[PDB]
Amino acid sequence: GAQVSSQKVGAHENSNRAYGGSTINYTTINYYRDSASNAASKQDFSQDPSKFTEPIKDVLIKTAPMLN
Amino acid sequence: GAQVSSQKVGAHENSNRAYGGSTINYTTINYYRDSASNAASKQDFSQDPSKFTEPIKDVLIKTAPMLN
Amino acid sequence: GAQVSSQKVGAHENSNRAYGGSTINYTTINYYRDSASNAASKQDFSQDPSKFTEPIKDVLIKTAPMLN
Amino acid sequence: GAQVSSQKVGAHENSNRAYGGSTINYTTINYYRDSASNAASKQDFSQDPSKFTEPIKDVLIKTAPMLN
Amino acid sequence: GAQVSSQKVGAHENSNRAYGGSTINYTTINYYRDSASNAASKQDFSQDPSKFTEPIKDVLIKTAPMLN
Amino acid sequence: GLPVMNTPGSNQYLTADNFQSPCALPEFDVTPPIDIPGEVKNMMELAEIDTMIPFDLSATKKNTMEMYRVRLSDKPHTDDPILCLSLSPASDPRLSHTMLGEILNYYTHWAGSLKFTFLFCGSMMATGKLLVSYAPPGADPPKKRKEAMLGTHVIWDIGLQSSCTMVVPWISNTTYRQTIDDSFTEGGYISVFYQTRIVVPLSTPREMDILGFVSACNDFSVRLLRDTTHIEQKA
Amino acid sequence: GLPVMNTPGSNQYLTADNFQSPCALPEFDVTPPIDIPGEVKNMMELAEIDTMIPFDLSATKKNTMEMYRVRLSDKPHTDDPILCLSLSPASDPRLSHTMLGEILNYYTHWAGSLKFTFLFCGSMMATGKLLVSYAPPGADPPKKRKEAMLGTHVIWDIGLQSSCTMVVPWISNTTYRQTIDDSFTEGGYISVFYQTRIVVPLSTPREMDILGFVSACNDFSVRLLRDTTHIEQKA
Amino acid sequence: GLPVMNTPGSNQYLTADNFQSPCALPEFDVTPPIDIPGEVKNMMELAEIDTMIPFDLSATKKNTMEMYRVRLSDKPHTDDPILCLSLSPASDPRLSHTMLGEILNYYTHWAGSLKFTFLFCGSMMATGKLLVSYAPPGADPPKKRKEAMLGTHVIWDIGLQSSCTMVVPWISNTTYRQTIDDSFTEGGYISVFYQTRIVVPLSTPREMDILGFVSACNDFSVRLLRDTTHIEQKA
Amino acid sequence: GLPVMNTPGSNQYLTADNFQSPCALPEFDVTPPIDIPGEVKNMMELAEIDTMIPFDLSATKKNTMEMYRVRLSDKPHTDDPILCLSLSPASDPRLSHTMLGEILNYYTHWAGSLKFTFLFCGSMMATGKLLVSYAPPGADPPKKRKEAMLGTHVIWDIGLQSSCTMVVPWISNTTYRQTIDDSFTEGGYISVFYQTRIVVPLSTPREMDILGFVSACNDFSVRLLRDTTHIEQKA
Amino acid sequence: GSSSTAATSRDALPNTEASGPTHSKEIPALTAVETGATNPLVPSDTVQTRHVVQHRSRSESSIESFFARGACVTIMTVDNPASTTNKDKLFAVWKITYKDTVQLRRKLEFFTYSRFDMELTFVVTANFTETNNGHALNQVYQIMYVPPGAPVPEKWDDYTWQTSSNPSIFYTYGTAPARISVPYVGISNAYSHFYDGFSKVPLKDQSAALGDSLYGAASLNDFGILAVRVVNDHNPTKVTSKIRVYLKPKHIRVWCPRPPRAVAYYGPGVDYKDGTLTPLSTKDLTTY
Amino acid sequence: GSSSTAATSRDALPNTEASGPTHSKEIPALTAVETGATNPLVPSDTVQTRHVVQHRSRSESSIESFFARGACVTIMTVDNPASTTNKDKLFAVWKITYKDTVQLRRKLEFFTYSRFDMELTFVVTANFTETNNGHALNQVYQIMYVPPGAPVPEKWDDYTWQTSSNPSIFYTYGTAPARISVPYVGISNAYSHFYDGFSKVPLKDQSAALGDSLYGAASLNDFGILAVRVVNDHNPTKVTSKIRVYLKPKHIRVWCPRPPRAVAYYGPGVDYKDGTLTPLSTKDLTTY
Ligand SMILES: CCCCCCCCCCCCCCCC(=O)O
Ligand SMILES: CCCCCCCCCCCCCCCC(=O)O
Ligand SMILES: *C(=O)CCCCCCCCCCCCC
Ligand SMILES: *C(=O)CCCCCCCCCCCCC
Ligand SMILES: *C(=O)CCCCCCCCCCCCC
Ligand SMILES: *C(=O)CCCCCCCCCCCCC
Ligand SMILES: *C(=O)CCCCCCCCCCCCC
């Protein structure tokens, strides 16, 4: 029950028949029934900051006057 | 001869391309011939408590008088 | 080159979606070229005791007189 | 990338549903890029001793006179 | 998610039903999400030395006079 | 390297383990088997063979050939026992050194049916009827034919078929019994009585021996391997 | 057992590792999440929020509400600066304790564009034009409008839209800058000047404050996690 | 990490093991083989080559070229032996330092057929018949032709084919013999006798030598590798 | 846990190993490469570049710019050498500090063809013919043109193409040579002679220099990485 | 599941082709090094050659293989003294660099720029120093990476060793040498082995002191420090320890080749010292 | 994925065929060893035989199996003394060879030439020497391979132990014996166990001293040295240690069989010593 995922490669070795290029993957297998035992996957999501940067009721159009 | 089963995930990491969401499984392989050597699977069953809570010969209908 | 075999389960945990029931198997892989290095499989055969208990030339029929 | 090969079994356990009989194999996986790191396979060849035992230019027919 | 690659075999054991001949491969599995954690593959490329040995604007034809 | 984490049990040597280990003589040219007569596949095959019971362990007969001989005679009928033995196959002194008993002393638990066969060794002119009995436990052990006759029993008529077998059927509260003297798993009582009497004509020996044998039936098994108290090494 | 060979790193505890480990409370019945408002997914979301700059850290104003107020007045035009600040967002004392600065002090490297927004808090009757400037590093830091006007700048006209934003575009030799004062990765100079002057009618306050805010743009990132010098525990 | 549990054998160094290990010179540019004449694939190929037997180890001939020469003469027929040797190829002093013997001293067990070839080195004018014998063990070792003639033997007629081979067929109770002097696995007796006598004309040498050689047949094998007693290093 | 058994090598640190290890800075935002001119993929690319030979290491010229200048003059023809050098590219003092030599001192073994190119730096009015020679080892090293002329050689005519290359073909008994002075893997002798003489007209310098360069050919390789003796750190 | 594997580093070099006598206007041997080019000759250009199937390769001199070794870059000393000492417990602080030793430094300096992941391996040794019979229990060491800007420890036991964000290794004495990897962490697109410049422009309108900086220095290479301590409390018998740090540059690319260092190193720049400038020995021009 | 597996080493030898009486001109028994050939007879050529299905094999006498063992080739001594000693800390230097011991040497010398990968295993033991009660902490050893040409260490702590390019093993006392593999590294196509020649041709025109060299010696076999040290600093109680080196030739081929060494070895060549030339014992010609 292996999970195979890709690595985001930073420094690439001089190689494209083994390392740097042809997508380098890594493998994870969970050994425990409790998910709290799992390592962190770090495959995380981002979001728009608007709930903090623009919490105003009427939409902000930046080219327009904020007050109108 | 691997057994793959699913985990019931409690805290989910911010991830659905690796952790929290797309069912997280775990793997078990038994290494010994004797089943007493096995770990516990914890995949256990529940049952109705009636043999202790309602051991009466004639069925209990709760909206009805118990004595009739 | 894995050998998968079944265990004869004695005490069964309260489980039939993981342990006790749906045949529990175990896995063996030999790591050495010499078969003397192998573990014992314990998958052994029995035989009829007759070569010791009934080594007589003319067949014994138990309901009949042994001497006739 | 496993190599599976057969063992030549010497002492056989009382078993033919797991050990002694149904060809017992073993598994090898090389962990290193350098072949000098490999274990020895011991799957070796023999040859005719003739280059040492019969290095004569004209073929030896043993039933015939060696000198003729 | 295994990577299987071939070894360049230098000394060959007396064997072609297991070692020396029938291409000997080796296996790599990455255990970490960060590619900096990876071993080196050593599957590297070469290039022509010309950017250092012949950095001249007009192509060198060795059978011809260099100055013409 | 592959990340690993050692668990409890690591580095121990359990003498009952079953692991692989490296060979000190790789590629050794092993000599092949030949088909030797008499191969054994299970210790219970040996337990199914009749072996002779040392019934008479009196101070002067024990540890001599006489311990195997049960003496009978043509005396008038009595209801008193010829022999009395407890069904404790690994620990009663008369059964524990039979082949069945000595194999049971390498195991903690036994279960199944047993059988006792008696051989009459008097002259051909001697006749008689005997009663062989098994009384399952829990009551006064039989000391008179009247009580023994109420349990499992075979009335043996002596004659051209020289021998007679009584089967001790597995009758037990527990699913296995202990191979030591133990009340909770006690097995009951074996006894032999004169049913009529031994009769001989004149010019015939009036006393003679019977020999008894015990063996396991095909439903017999043992478990929980253990060392025996039947051998030791002092210092 | 499977033949294995321990490599370097074996048995160490790297505090940044990411391995599995056994659970001390197996089958615990975990309470499910509810949808709490305000979830955050990345620390840079917090860096994109405007927070107020403690511009005036004079001996008597620092550590008081007055440190946030930049005082202006209707005095005659001058080319001298209202304020001068270095673009060192994690280490200049005016920026390092803003939300952007305090997050940058948990990282070693920063990169991307920033923006400064100023709020005029004088009366509605007060008018004025100011010049907000960013001069990338390598020359004399601007102390006169003549020099500041040659760099990146916004001329702010005060009026009904109360506030004005100057974007500090990412202009850097290195691909990331250090979060400490460092010449090689220095960021340049922020300054504000009077463009015309503040003018008020009679019966109006002649002095008033502006407040400034800093936040990251959507191209801003940080890396190499590190401890901050902004908290400690003595003994 | 993957839960693992160390078994017995962990961390030992068995000198006969066969494991992988890291390379100290990764990516080394190995020189390729060339086809050198004389490659050997198995030590038994060397054992199949005839090498010469030091038959005469008398106090004055041992450790000299004379130890290889068996002297014959044209003396009248006798039934007494020319030579007597035990079939103990790794431990009889005459066989143990032949190539066959020196390879057998790196193994504990040997099995298979052997062959002895004798070369007549007298003049062309010399004639004769000799009897070469192998007597499998268990009886009085042959000291007279009468007894030797009852075992396996070849009667050699001397002539233009200079040499004669007697095959010692594998005749043994055990499936392999020990490579030390041992009664249980003893191999028997090799001897040579005059069948008629050596005859020469006048003007001819009346004494001459024969040389003997031993080699393994194609059914010969050895096992259980061991160190030899034929070399040592004192201090 | 999975039963495992540690082998030899366990827990060692081999400095040439090649294993995975945990990252101390997980999810670090790595700066991408840019296409910098001049990337190198193999050290032998550097060995193929001509670098200048310090031929004249006399006590007063060594460690000065004069060590690179080989002085010639218009003197009458002689058969005596202009220069003599041994083909030991990592250990002869004239070759070991060239780029080829300094890379060969990080390896134990070298193999392949080399080439020497000479540049004439006299005036345009100067003419001449020189003989450049390579004598493979095993005979008296050439000290006269008569002997040098019998080996591999190029007769160089000085003229508008200013320079001349002699290729030293790989001629060796071993498949690789040692990078130290060693007789078994010795490489032979390089020498330069006057073929006719340098001739100049009047009003022209009668003495002038030639410069020599060495580089590897495309069949050149090295192996067995090792530390160099060309750098050290005392205490 | 299973992935299975244009001139590569382990390919055989070119064969020698057979070539015979020649008489023509083709002139491979004559050339002009003034152009800046090296003459690309092979033996068949100037002698007669036979055919040879070449099997040698340049596999061991690829950049990766030339650098595939851990090299010692520093030795850090720490101790764990009695609590009654007048002297403070010694913890070590090392500014990370490959320039405190010379061998790896010289190899990297065959190039101007490089990119690589770094593998660090740590070998730890300890000993008693006072001729005493007292004992010590097995030590645990904390190796903390303190990146530029983070608080450097001032005492072996102050709050900074909490390491909530710095990475730390807790190494147990007597176990396999510790090891971690780090990505390419440079603030540039490649590490600079040589920087011909300054970190400050001195301005006319400013004092000379204010515009001054060291030649060839920049935060291009400031990577922070390693701080190391014995975690165990003070013990009555003093133990001293050393941590040797080994650096292997893996997954490496390099650019712009340079002549190697030929006189002894003298500080972290290219400076040289009087009395060390004579690398060549005496040899007569016409002596083999 | 999974690969699954012409006379092999473990095949059964040939069966004996039944053969009966014979009377003919076929003469297997007569032969002529002058030809240089061995007579290829089997028992059915000279006696009556029965049929026998042969099961024995030569699996354990294949070249690989004959050599599949680690053999001790040297013992290296090192120590770690007090800092107050007049004597220098002992580090060891060993020129790599299989000729310092005799057992593996004799087995390899059944052949003239060989090719193999080499597995080296290292067993390390230590002890106290002064009847003192002082103690020492667990030692780490550095085993450095110094190939020919690299700087040999002159002190236990000089710069050469930096090992930027030499391979080194840091072994921790009390752990599993260290182990590495090396490829076939010979500068020839096979290792020469015997070299009938010299490394120098003496020339007439040169002094005898200048043309002289040892008989049978060549860099064919110069493989450099192992240098070993205790890495730990000086300790007040002296500890001495020994490193035993075991060599197993694996993946081996051999050529040109030779008679084995029959008198005691005497140096690295084939020389013998007076008083050791009598390997055979006394036995009378007609005594069994
Ligand atoms: C717990 C261990 C943490 C290890 C932290 C490693 C920090 C980065 C070190 C960068 C090494 C740079 C080498 C090249 C230097 C240069 O530019 O000259
Ligand atoms: C860190 C350990 C490094 C080990 C280095 C091994 C170096 C090569 C040794 C070659 C052994 C040669 C054996 C055969 C010698 C012969 O030709 O007679
Ligand atoms: C998915 O899990 C099936 C593929 C199995 C691959 C090998 C598993 C490696 C060992 C895991 C052991 C079980 C862990 C408790
Ligand atoms: C099912 O068992 C087949 C899949 C095998 C996966 C890899 C097995 C991992 C090692 C188990 C070793 C044997 C344990 C005694
Ligand atoms: C059959 O063997 C192929 C399936 C392979 C499963 C994984 C093998 C686990 C590791 C075995 C290593 C080799 C042992 C010498
Ligand atoms: C072939 O190699 C693919 C099958 C993979 C089976 C499991 C591999 C077991 C672990 C090997 C790890 C990599 C060794 C460097
Ligand atoms: C590809 O990865 C799928 C094949 C899986 C083969 C067995 C994996 C061996 C154990 C890897 C464990 C996970 C490492 C973090």
Side-chain angles (χ1 to χ4, degrees), chain J residues 69-72 101-104 107 123-133 135 173-175 239 242 244 246, chain K residues 1 132-138 140 156 159-160 162-167 170 172 175 229 231-236:
Chain J
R69 297 277 108 114
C72 188
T101 59
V102 305
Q103 294 189 148
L104 173 59
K107 295 177 63 183
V123 177
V124 185
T125 51
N127 61 279
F128 292 107
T129 54
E130 60 205 37
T131 324
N132 181 340
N133 257 252
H135 300 285
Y173 196 75
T175 60
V239 175
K242 278 172 176 180
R244 283 167 168 82
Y246 300 80
Chain K
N132 181 340
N133 257 252
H135 300 285
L137 297 174
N138 204 60
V140 174
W156 80 278
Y159 75 95
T160 66
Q162 277 169 49
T163 18
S164 72
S165 306
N166 296 345
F170 288 90
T172 299
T175 60
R229 67 176 178 156
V231 179
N232 313 57
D233 289 332
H234 296 84
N235 187 74

Side-chain angles (χ1 to χ4, degrees), chain A residues 2-4 26-29 31, chain E residues 1-2 29-32, chain F residues 2-3, chain G residues 20, chain J residues 1-2:
Chain A
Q3 165 71 351
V4 178
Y26 71 105
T27 303
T28 301
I29 291 173
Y31 312 123
Chain E
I29 291 173
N30 291 146
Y31 312 123
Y32 299 92
Chain F
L2 166 73
Chain G
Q20 294 174 59
Chain J
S2 298

